[PDB]
Amino acid sequence: QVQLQQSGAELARPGASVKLSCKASGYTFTSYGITWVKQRPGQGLEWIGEIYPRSTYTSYNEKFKGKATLTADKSSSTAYMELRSLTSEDSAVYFCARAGNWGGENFFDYWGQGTTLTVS
Amino acid sequence: GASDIVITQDELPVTSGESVSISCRSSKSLLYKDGKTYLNWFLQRPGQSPQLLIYLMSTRASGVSDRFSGSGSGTDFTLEIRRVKAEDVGVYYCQQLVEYPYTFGGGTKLEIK
Numbered sequence A: 001q002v003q004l005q006q007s008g009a010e011l012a013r014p015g016a017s018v019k020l021s022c023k024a025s026g027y028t029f030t031s032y033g034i035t036w037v038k039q040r041p042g043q044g045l046e047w048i049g050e051i052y053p054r055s056t057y058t059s060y061n062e063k064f065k066g067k068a069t070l071t072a073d074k075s076s077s078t079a080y081m082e083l084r085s086l087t088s089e090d091s092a093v094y095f096c097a098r099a100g101n102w103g104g105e106n107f108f109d110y111w112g113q114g115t116t117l118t119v120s
Numbered sequence B: 001g002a003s004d005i006v007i008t009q010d011e012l013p014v015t016s017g018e019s020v021s022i023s024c025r026s027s028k029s030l031l032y033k034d035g036k037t038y039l040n041w042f043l044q045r046p047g048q049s050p051q052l053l054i055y056l057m058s059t060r061a062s063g064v065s066d067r068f069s070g071s072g073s074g075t076d077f078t079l080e081i082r083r084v085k086a087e088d089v090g091v092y093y094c095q096q097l098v099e100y101p102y103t104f105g106g107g108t109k110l111e112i113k
């Protein structure tokens, strides 16, 4: 059973940073990637970026470059997203999801439950 | 981003057991040189994570009811929802994966009468 388990909701102050985690289990973590999505309260979905721990490959939406930093720890099958210089626009639910390989399988097939960030 | 692919969705309360179709248009073709069309449909139920319904334009994801079907041309797409149920309530999104950045439509809400 594939599972992605996200860290708990957080309250943060403007100007602070936070580091959100996404723990993967039930499959070979390094055979796939992890991708992150933002949803502001009441709003749509936005793609942040992806990371592939085996090759270290990353891709970012330019909108989030230097707001979001994606890392991964192969030794614990955990992906991280650090959000810096927080503002009220950063209040959202952040999801992680699996990212797949060439051929288009396993893209956004499993999701974490989301982490709510509230910037005060 | 000025050059990002823009995805537009149509708007729809649906009577239980009736049917709706949701449409999605892309500003560029999502048909890649490999012959596949990189268009996803998601349902995000309230308080839940988005669920992949359809990928590669027309392939139903594992676990998804055959009440959902996807079709399209490469620039225009449709999600058919048969025999609508309470569990179908939420926001439907289409998403393209043909080019970076990946982009989503603005969502289509479905509410049950």
Ligand SMILES: C=CC[N+]1([C@H]2C[C@H]3[C@@H]4CC[C@H]5C[C@H](O)[C@@H](N6CCOCC6)C[C@]5(C)[C@H]4CC[C@]3(C)[C@H]2OC(C)=O)CCCC1
Pocket (backbone or CB within 6 Å): A030, A031, A032, A033, A052, A054, A055, A056, A057, A100, A101, A102, A103, A104, A105, A107, B032, B038, B097, B098, B099, B100
């Ligand atoms: C069909 C085209 C659409 N794009 C391609 C782009 C493709 C990626 C290019 C970069 C690769 C680096 C990475 O190191 C690779 N390794 C990970 C470890 O295992 C072996 C492979 C896979 C990798 C992430 C590719 C996976 C499939 C990628 C996302 C493709 O997208 C899809 C949805 O299939 C083009 C631009 C936007 C996405």
